[PDB]
Subunit: 368 residues, 2 copies
């Protein structure tokens, strides 16, 4: 009791890549590859590459576009990664800069200032460097005094981060700033038709406070769950240098079919057990804020936990515009539609994905 | 009551002595300084400087360190360990070490996998971004619940202990906290002012809500961060997109500035914590401090206790392990927790990069 999400913030870069631009770009790479390797095709030595299309992407996921940090290099079929420049230690890192922008909006929405915050958690799927923690970089750019740390549970990092925020509040923290900064274009493989469309870039932030007198979503129950799986994995890391690594697996890899099979029943089972635990039915939940990877997966999970005739409207979809933003997804959804929940009504925040990880939070809105 | 009831320790097999390391770097610089003579006498590339086992020990108190693979580190044409990519079906290197340390901590604590609700990997460098290595560790141990990766570099262990307590305060029975530090994988062996600092280790700890198990009860925690570039490594996943070229993808430090900044900061945190808890420095049986610089711990101990405080109160293990980053303070607690008798108090304090400081007052219970 007494712990509320009182504000959220959102930043996305300016440039947009539509499905068609992305498909056009990969088609060119696949075409050139299949020419250059034609004799290797006819020989069965190397595997031929298959193009993609806007319809195949949208039908597979519900994604239509995504925001990206830098558009040219991603679409450039001879580059297939954003065109970025190294920054000097004296300027904000990219990740710290995005985090600060999202975080200032969360703070302004919650009506708090730097001196009001005690903890800064950077919770996301990939940190730009190991030390000093980018969370501490964000913390000091904002002028916040307390402590900060980086934390990684991939797609579920925001719901784990909310639990850790609530845990620190129970122990004495007044207010926690939770920040998720996902520059997925830095570790996505744009050569692969099966994953090149999945992810977008974004930063989100949340202010979590101990309060009974500010409007916000009070956290009622948290279920976190992990179970190791290699069905989503990125083997890039600081030991690749010492391994003299050669395997081409240093970016996002996924068996999408197995993830879909494994995670849908996992999420629904966790949500249902949580609702039972809380003496609530699915029809007491005004909004399900679900992970934003795949609208079919969401509709599936939604129709199990709720009725088959539940209104589309109760599980907001933002992935059409952002693609999958990994840990940031549920926060985007909450940021865009929390206003659709009435005073006293209930909501569910649930992330799921890599690691296998699942986090599920029951909340109830209070208006001050 | 929340209590540290077991610790565990794994280090790799091979040792590198200061003399072996100094010999190796000296081979590297004498040879480099030959390949680039037209630039030593031209002022474009500065002449590189060697060192010695004497310089190393005086600077730090370090005499040796364990490393994951010795030959490639010492080889002046390579200056980094020789490792092999493992397949996904194999325990990764970092999960493997953390498991070995975890099993020992569990055995010392008298617990099995089924007794553990949370697994935290708190260390200075994760081997990969996802799936979290903590989840690989939890799986391999057969633990149920949830796991996650957390990074505050040198202070990861004390920050991790805090999150362990928080998680227990909110319903967890028991937390396994693991620190795995393959510092040889991001150290710059070309640089005479840092190439000796770090060693490799894995440590683990069990934290429990209990009033009946022998261990160290957590009485107060104070964590602190404040951004500093005085310790930094710019290696990361965006390096490829930056088409990065600066030679800064390894550990880098301004050793003098960290010494001046950190020493008083830590003593101030400790002193303030001591006064908060109705304690004097004479009440503290043992100070388990970060294990980076023996002179730094010497000075901190005099900064908080008497000029007359005997070095027995602040155990040192960096002579054998070198600086083990987050794990260092857990090695010291593991090696000398027995030196504290029932009802006596202790202080666990790590500090370092980020500027981070974490400090914990404990009291031993039988």
């Amino acid at each position: 009791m007494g712990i509320r999400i009182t504000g959220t913030g959102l930043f996305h870069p300016t440039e947009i890549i539509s499905n068609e631009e992305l498909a056009d770009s990969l088609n060119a790479y696949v075409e050139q590859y299949n020419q250059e390797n034609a004799e290797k095709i006819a020989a069965g030595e190397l595997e031929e590459l298959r193009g993609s299309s806007a319809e195949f992407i949208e039908k597979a996921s519900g994604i239509k576009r995504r925001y990206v940090i830098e558009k040219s290099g991603i679409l450039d079929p001879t580059r297939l990664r954003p065109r970025l420049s190294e920054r000097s230690n004296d300027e904000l890192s990219i990740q710290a800069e995005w985090g600060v922008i999202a975080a200032k909006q969360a703070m302004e929405n919650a009506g708090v200032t730097a001196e009001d915050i005690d903890v800064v958690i950077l919770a996301c799927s990939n940190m730009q460097r190991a030390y000093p923690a980018v969370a501490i970089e964000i913390q000091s750019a904002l002028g916040i005094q307390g402590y900060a740390y980086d934390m990684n549970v991939a797609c579920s990092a925001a719901t784990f981060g909310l639990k850790q925020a609530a845990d620190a509040i129970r122990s004495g923290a007044r207010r926690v700033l939770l920040v998720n900064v996902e520059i997925t274009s830095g570790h996505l493989d744009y050569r692969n038709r099966d994953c090149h469309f999945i992810f977008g870039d974004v930063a989100t932030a949340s202010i979590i406070e101990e309060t009974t007198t500010k409007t916000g979503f009070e956290i009622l129950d948290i279920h976190l769950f992990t179970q190791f799986s290699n069905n989503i994995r990125n083997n890039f890391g600081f030991l690749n240098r010492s391994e003299d690594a050669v395997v081409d697996d240093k970016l996002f890899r996924q068996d999408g079919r197995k993830v879909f099979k494994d995670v849908c029943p996992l999420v629904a089972k966790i949500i249902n057990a949580q609702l039972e635990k809380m003496q609530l039915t699915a029809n007491d939940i005004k909004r399900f804020w679900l992970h934003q990877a795949n609208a079919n997966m969401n509709e599936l999970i939604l129709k199990y936990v709720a009725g088959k005739d539940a209104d589309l409207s109760r599980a907001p979809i933002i992935l059409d515009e952002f693609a999958n933003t990994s840990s940031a997804g549920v926060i985007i959804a909450l940021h865009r539609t929390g206003h659709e929940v009435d005073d006293g009504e209930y909501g569910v925040i649930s992330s799921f994905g890599a690691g296998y990880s699942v986090g599920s939070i029951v909340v109830q809105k209070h208006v001050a």
